[PDB]
Structure formats: C-alpha cells, structure tokens
Amino acid sequence: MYVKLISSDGHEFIVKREHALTSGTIKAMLSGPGQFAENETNEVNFREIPSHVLSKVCMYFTYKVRYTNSSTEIPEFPIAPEIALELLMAANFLDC
Amino acid sequence: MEGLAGYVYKAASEGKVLTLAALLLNRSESDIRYLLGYVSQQGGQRSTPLIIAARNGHAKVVRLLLEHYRVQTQQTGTVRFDGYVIDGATALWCAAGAGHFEVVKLLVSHGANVNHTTVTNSTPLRAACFDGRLDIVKYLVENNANISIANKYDNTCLMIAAYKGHTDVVRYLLEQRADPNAKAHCGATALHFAAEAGHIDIVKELIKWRAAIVVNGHGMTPLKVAAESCKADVVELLLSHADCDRRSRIEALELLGASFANDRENYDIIKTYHYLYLAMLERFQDGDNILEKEVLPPIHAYGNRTECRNPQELESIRQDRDALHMEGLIVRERILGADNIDVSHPIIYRGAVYADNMEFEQCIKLWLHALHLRQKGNRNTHKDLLRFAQVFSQMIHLNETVKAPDIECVLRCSVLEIEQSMNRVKNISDADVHNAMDNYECNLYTFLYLVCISTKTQCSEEDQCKINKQIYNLIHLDPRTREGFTLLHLAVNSNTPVDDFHTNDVCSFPNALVTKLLLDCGAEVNAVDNEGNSALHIIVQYNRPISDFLTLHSIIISLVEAGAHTDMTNKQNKTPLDKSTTGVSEILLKTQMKMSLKCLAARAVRANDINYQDQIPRTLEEFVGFH
Amino acid sequence: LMIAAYKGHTDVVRYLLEQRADPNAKAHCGATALHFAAEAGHIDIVKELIKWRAAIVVNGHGMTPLKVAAESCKADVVELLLSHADCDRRSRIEALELLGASFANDRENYDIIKTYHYLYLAMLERFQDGDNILEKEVLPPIHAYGNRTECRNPQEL
Amino acid sequence: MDVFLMIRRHKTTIFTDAKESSTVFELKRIVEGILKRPPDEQRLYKDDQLLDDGKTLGECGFTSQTARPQAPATVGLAFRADDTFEALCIEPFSSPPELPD
C-alpha cells in the first residue's frame, strides 16, 4: 500500500503508492519482475539521486496529489536555487 | 547636404531659374555638384531634381543649368509610377516618357544618352515608344541611337508600338527598315502584339511589310491571336494574306466564334452562332476532301456534350443559351489545346456568371476544370482558390450545401499549389521574392478559408478522412509565412487577413472548429514563430474574451489536450500566463495548466540564471530553452 | 443623446458628444443612454460613450448599464462596459453570472452551452484566489425551480 | 484543515497525511499501520519536544499554515530497543552542491 523510495545515500522516503505512482518512471520501475508484491515494501532503489533531490520529489508528489485541480491558483513550490539543476534531471529520470 | 538637396528639389519642380541660382552658388565646388548629382527621396520613391524638371517639362530651369554648369543626364532614376516604380533609368529616360519634346533636345547637346542601357536595357526610345510622340521618336533616332535594342524577353520597339495605340511610331520604324520578324522569348513576332488589341490600322500597316506567319511558343499562329482576342476587324484582315489554306481558315472562324461565346467586354450570342455556323458550313461545303470535325473525348465538366459534327445540331441549339456557351468552350479547347494562357478565362467567366445566376454545381464543375487546366500550366491559381472559397461562403450564407468531393478536389489542388509556391520561394534568390511570398501567404490563407468552410459543411466520412489526409500532407509540408507563423498560428491569431468578399461572412479567426481539425490532423502544437510564440501563446492575446467565450474556451481545451506547453517562453521570456493580456483568458489557462515537476524545476533554473549549459542531458538543453 | 443612442445612430451621438452634450443625461426612467445603448446593443455607440467617460448610474429597478447589458443577452456590450475599469470584482462576477443566466432563458438567443460556459467562467473567478473568495449569497430555495440552491461549488456546477 | 507531515528517524523519512484534530496517538496508529511497529515503542517528537499522545496536531502546533503541505514540518521518531527507548537520531539529508560559478 506504501512504496519505499530510497535515495543513493540510503535515506528512505516512504510515501503512499499512488502518490509516487503519479510519476511515470516510478510506475515503470514498480511494474515487471521488480514488483515483489509482498504488499508492504514495493521498494525502488535509485542509484544516481541525491537525498535532497528525491526529498523535494516526494514533496512534489504530495503537492500534485493534493492540488491536482482544486481552485485555480496553487501555492508556489519552494525550489531552492542550489537544488535546481539536480531536481530537473531527476524530473527527466522520473518523467514526472 | 540632404536638406540642401530638398531645397533645390523644389526650385526645379517649380520651374524657376532665379531661385536655383542662389541655391547653387556662393559655395565650394564639392557641395554644389552634389545637389545636381543625387536623387531626392520624396513620396517613398527617389527622383533626381532634374527628373522632376523633365517630368513636368520645365525646360526653362533645366536649359540654363546645362549652359552654366556641367550637369549630366546619366543620373539613375525610376521609370514611371504606373505600377512599375523600378530604378535604373537615366534622366533622359523620363525626358521622352513625360511627353515633352522641349526637354529632349536640350539634353542631347550636353552629353547625349540616347544609347542608355539600364538593367532592362531600356533606351530612351523605348520610353518614347511608350509615350508615342512622333517628334521625340524622330529626333532621338536622328541623334545616332540604335533601334534594335531588345530586353530579356526581346522587347523590340516595334512590338510596343504595335501593342500601344500610337500607330505613328510603328509606321516610322518601317521607313528605317526595321526587323519585321523580331523573335521574342515566347515567339511573339510583331503580328502577335499588333493583332491582339484590335488595332486595325497597325495590323494593316504591316501587311505591306510582310510580317508573315510564325507559330509562337504557346502554339498559336498570329491569325489565331486575333481570333482569340474577340477582334473580328483584324480576323478578316489576316484572312486575306493569300497564304492561309483550308485548315487554318475555318479554325480561325471557329476560334473567333469560341472566343465570342464567353467574354466580359464582347459577349454576343447571335454573332457566336453565326460565326460558328459560317465555319460549320465552310467545313461541310463540298463533300469532297471535306474538312470533317474531329471530336474531343467527352468531358463531365461540360455536361455530356460531344461537340457539333453537323450543321443541323448546331442550329437546334441556337435558341438555348447555355448550350452555345458550353459548345464554344469545347471547340476552344480543340483549337488552343490545354496550354494557352487564356484558355480557361472563358470558363472562369462562365463560372462567375453561373454563380451570379445562382447555378452552383455547374459553376463548381467548370471552375474545377479551369483550375485543373491552369494547374497543368504551372500557374498561380491562388485567385482561383480564392474564387472557390468565395463561392463556397456564398453558398454557406444562403445555406446551400457544398458537395464534399468538390471541396476535397479544391483542397488537394490548393495543397499542390502550396507545394509549387514553396518551390518558387525556394529557388528564387532575389528576383521576385516579395511577389512569391505574397502569393504563398495568399495561398495559405485561401487554404485556411477552404478548411473553415469544410469544417462548417457536412461531408462524407470517407471523404472527411480524405480531407484529413490532405491537411495531414500539408502539415507535413510545414507551411511557414514571413513571421514564421505556422498553419496553426494563422488559425489562432485574429490578425489573420480575411478577404472582403463572402469569405468574411464565414471565416471568424480564431476559429474553434479549425484548430480542432488541425490538431486532429497532427499540426505541431508547439510550433514557434520568429518570436517563439506557440499556438496557445497567441490565443491568450485574444482581445475578445467574453464576446466569443465559447470560441476561446474550445480552442484552449483543444490546444492543451493536444499537448501544448503552457510555459513556453517567447524570445522576450514571457509565458502564456504572462502574455495573457486579458483577465478572462488568464483564468481558463490556469484551469488547464497540468502540473509538472519538470516545468517547475526548469522555471527555477531559468529564473535563477544557473549555468545549465552542458551540465544536463542534451535533450534537456532544448527543454530549458522552452521554460 | 438618449433618443439617438437607443436607436442605431452612432453619428448623431458622436456629434453631440463633441458638441459638449450631457455626459450623464439622466431621465425619469433613470437612464444615461448607456442603458439605452445596452438595451439594443449598438456597440459603436457604447464605444462612443465610453470614449467620453459617460459614467455609470443605477437604474430605477436597481441596474447598472453593465447589468442591463447582461440582462439583454448582449455579450459585446458586457465586454465594452467591463473594459471601462470602473468596476470591481463583485461587479464583474455579478455581470458574468447575469449574462450566463440570461442566455439560459430567452427565445431569440437560447444557447445552453453558452450558459454553462459563462456560469463556469463566473464560478472560476469566484474561486480564483483560493482564499478571500467572493462566496455566493444564495437565497432560500424557490419551490418553482425545484428546491436547488444555485451552485456554490465548482463541482456543483 | 488537514496537513501532511514527515516522520524522520535516523535516515528513514516517511510522509503521511493527518488532520489538525487528529491526535499524536492517531499518528502513532498510522505509523504502526505502515512501519509495522507497536506505538508504545514509538515516541513522536516535534523538534526535540516530547508530544502527549492525546494532544491534537493543532494543539501541538501543526496548523494548516505552519506545517505547509508542500514543505511540511519534521516530526521526530524514537523507537524502543528491548525495554529501553532509543535516543532521537535524525541524519540530515545530503548537502546540495555549491552553486556553479
């Protein structure tokens, strides 16, 4: 029911399964023989993602699940200038 | 100086001597000669101060200029303002072209330029031939000027004299024993130009000189030229040169009867039959070596007529109007073939008549056949496509249905015409680039009008698929205007021109139906102009959000669903949200703006101006360029 | 001014406008000729009155010229009277709601898709800011129209 | 109304949803429902301050604006080893690299 995203350094970022599954590559990584449907772990082991980058990625997962179409305006995402240029590449790697 | 150039420009324009003396003296040698040796840009077209002296025939100001100075007539100027406005002409060129003999004689004694050759090698005699003044022409030859100067298409001075109504010029040229068989680029030698404007005196003037008969490049004899021009006065004159034979005598009468059948100025239905019946009886006059009428294959466009092989059947259709008009078109095709310049002009005239007479299906068939004939000749049928769109919109306004195969054929022909327009734009370096681009944009706009008509009309499902296939092919041809506006942009921006005719009653731009069709066919929804604007990046700039909110809501839904980036910045880095320029249109975008971490991160990168060059995947380097 | 603006004659209205006519030509009916222009949709006359800043007053029945334009199912007059910038968020919201409602019931121009689109545009602008939203003020339900209490939610609409 | 929030222990950092009126004990219930460990072994720490089990999130300080949804507040987590409770250890995230140029 809950996916088990982990960064390169080992910082686990467990979140709701559909919250991650909003992205596409995290859906592809879950599907296939890498499923291991124990129904609790469903872990995905990234290799080239720093911890803060995937932290903000999980932030965005929750943020996009919450305000998917509610009202018109949404609060701005708090992307630090230093964490950019690594969040964008992790967006491509996740096809978010 | 530039200001002093305009000061002496008015002095020569008013024809004043004492005013120019104070404005061309009491100075050094360098600045004084500049005023008399430079053109003045007035009214958007440059002209010498001596040109405006020769143009108005102000001989008083310009005669004393040559006495007290050494000003020459070799100053480069324009030719005329009657739709030419091209430069390169000398100052003597406009001296003969202004119809003033008093200014020609003064320029000869001070540096005569009678043998001037411009980019079009147009001597002052050519302008004198265009002016048609006998005194100017006679004196200009007296100053040792060549008369056989031919342009790129061999514009002999006898041709322009034969083309124009100045019959005094052409009769003086033969007294100098000029060439009668002046071969042109298209093969038009003397009699082709003379016997086309109904100049009975000019054609008679060359009978003695024996201009003979030679087939030009369009496969037409000079006798057949008079028959095509609906000028019966010179048709009978050209039949009496004692070398016509039986084959070329009746066919000239048939051509004259066919040309008289459908024309704007000369539309005579009694003379059309009588000339044809005279030609019909001349063929069937002996019974031995009888000139039997060869029969063209039947054409569905002209109903199902199979010509008139007998005088009896021609008589039976004398009282019926459209049969005589339809019969004259077939015989005109038999004589002139499918390669004449004006073979389809009677067909277009008949189509316009039928459209004015509310006959639609026959008009569409005739205009389709005329379009096919003109397309076989590789000509800009943009006017024909505009006519098609106009009659389709006229049918729509009167709620008359338009058949789907008709608009399918018109759209396919327009797609091919756009292909050849791109070809003409590509190969031409600087010859007629502006004209080719204008024709290209007109073709694209006519295609859009026909597309809008097709969307409004009901069409067959398979033929709707054919329409989608034609539009798909055109999109894969990727049309592009001067601003880089793609086909999708012109179906979005309200600044897209619409013709003044009935097309203005059917074509509302932006159009909700057209954008749905273009995206369904597969238009690149992220296509950028020279400024980088997308299709959605322009629809927000609509200045009527609430007048046609149904229109603006449908297109933004269609553009977003196709996958247009809502963040694609222009060259000035303005998002469609930022270029909303409208309260309402901003609201609709905010609803359809699908979220993306990639978009937000790219906005953060671009706003912070981080050095992203060669630190990201190469396919992402373009993506930061968008956001 | 009002006589020539109720009928489609922009030339007389303009000529009086540069003849220093009444910018607020009040009447017993409480009009301005902006109301009269809105009643017949002479959009050029509306432009002429806007270019001289003919102002906006409340009619005898409680109507601004923008409201009269919205009631008469004339969208272009709503556009021109909304672009005059002397109208706040509440006025914009109520004008759009009135126009969308007026397209729902009128024999001359009954387009239900226009009704839904204009009502949804009005609702979106009501919930534009997320916070400080101009929430509806729906009266208790009327038995004639079933018992539905308007639509105070985007999903409700 | 509700917020989302982060529960951090050592390197693990789990995200969850919780009401303002939801108590710390309910957060322990959901942590048990995901992390599969009994809540009596678990202590939830706002920064370093121990939280009462019956205290709601609004009483603790997790309002709809203080714990902003896109940047939620960090709730510490301490487990129990046998009969002894472990100390609150939270490893920080990886340091972002220096801004180029």
Curated annotation (Swiss-Prot), chain A:
Gene3D superfamilies: Potassium Channel Kv1.1, Chain A. One of its GO terms (cellular component) is Cul2-RING ubiquitin ligase complex. It is found in: Nucleus. Keywords: Host-virus interaction, Nucleus, Transcription, Transcription regulation, Ubl conjugation, Ubl conjugation pathway. Overexpressed in prostate cancer cell line PC-3 and breast cancer cell line SK-BR-3. Pfam families: Skp1_POZ. Disulfide bonds: none annotated. One of its GO terms (molecular function) is protein-macromolecule adaptor activity. Pathway: Protein modification; protein ubiquitination. InterPro entries: ELC1, SKP1-like, SKP1/BTB/POZ_sf, Skp1_comp_POZ. CDD domains: BTB_POZ_EloC. Ubiquitinated by the DCX(AMBRA1) complex, leading to its degradation by the proteasome. GO terms for biological process: protein ubiquitination; regulation of transcription by RNA polymerase II; target-directed miRNA degradation; transcription initiation at RNA polymerase II promoter; ubiquitin-dependent protein catabolic process. Heterotrimer of an A (ELOA, ELOA2 or ELOA3P), ELOB and ELOC subunit. The elongin BC complex interacts with EPOP; leading to recruit the elongin BC complex to Polycomb group (PcG) target genes, thereby restricting excessive activity of the PRC2/EED-EZH2 complex. SIII, also known as elongin, is a general transcription elongation factor that increases the RNA polymerase II transcription elongation past template-encoded arresting sites. Subunit A is transcriptionally active and its transcription activity is strongly enhanced by binding to the dimeric complex of the SIII regulatory subunits B and C (elongin BC complex). Belongs to the SKP1 family. This is Elongin-C. The gene is ELOC.
From Swiss-Prot, chain C:
Widely expressed. Highly expressed in testis. Weakly expressed in other tissues. Zn(2+) 2 binds at C29, H61. Keywords: ANK repeat, Apoptosis, Cytoplasm, Metal-binding, Nucleus, Repeat, TPR repeat, Ubl conjugation pathway, Zinc. Zn(2+) binds at C29. One of its GO terms (molecular function) is ubiquitin-like ligase-substrate adaptor activity. ANK repeats lie at residues 1-25, 29-58, 61-91. GO terms for cellular component: Cul2-RING ubiquitin ligase complex; cytoplasm; cytosol; mitochondrion; nucleoplasm; nucleus; ubiquitin ligase complex. The keyword Nucleotide-binding does not apply. Zn(2+) 1 binds at H28. One of its GO terms (biological process) is proteasome-mediated ubiquitin-dependent protein catabolic process. Belongs to the fem-1 family. Substrate-recognition component of a Cul2-RING (CRL2) E3 ubiquitin-protein ligase complex of the DesCEND (destruction via C-end degrons) pathway, which recognizes a C-degron located at the extreme C terminus of target proteins, leading to their ubiquitination and degradation. The C-degron recognized by the DesCEND pathway is usually a motif of less than ten residues and can be present in full-length proteins, truncated proteins or proteolytically cleaved forms. Component of a CRL2 E3 ubiquitin-protein ligase complex, also named ECS (Elongin BC-CUL2/5-SOCS-box protein) complex, composed of CUL2, Elongin BC (ELOB and ELOC), RBX1 and substrate-specific adapter FEM1B. Homooligomer. Interacts with PPM1F and PHTF1. Interacts with the death domain of FAS/TNFRSF6 and TNFRSF1A. Interacts with CHEK1. Interacts with NKX3-1. This is Protein fem-1 homolog B. It comes from Homo sapiens. The lineage of its organism: Eukaryota, Metazoa, Chordata, Craniata, Vertebrata. The gene is FEM1B. The chain holds residues 158 to 314 of 627 of the full protein.
Swiss-Prot record, chain D:
The modification N-acetylmethionine is found at M1. It comes from the Eukaryota. One of its GO terms (cellular component) is cytosol. Signal peptide: none annotated. Pathway: Protein modification; protein ubiquitination. The modification Phosphothreonine is found at T84. It is found in: Nucleus. Pfam families: ubiquitin. Keywords: Acetylation, Host-virus interaction, Nucleus, Phosphoprotein, Transcription, Transcription regulation, Ubl conjugation pathway. Heterotrimer of an A (ELOA, ELOA2 or ELOA3P), ELOB and ELOC subunit. The elongin BC complex interacts with EPOP; leading to recruit the elongin BC complex to Polycomb group (PcG) target genes, thereby restricting excessive activity of the PRC2/EED-EZH2 complex. Belongs to the Elongin B family. SIII, also known as elongin, is a general transcription elongation factor that increases the RNA polymerase II transcription elongation past template-encoded arresting sites. Subunit A is transcriptionally active and its transcription activity is strongly enhanced by binding to the dimeric complex of the SIII regulatory subunits B and C (elongin BC complex). This is Elongin-B. It comes from Homo sapiens. The lineage of its organism: Eukaryota, Metazoa, Chordata, Craniata, Vertebrata.
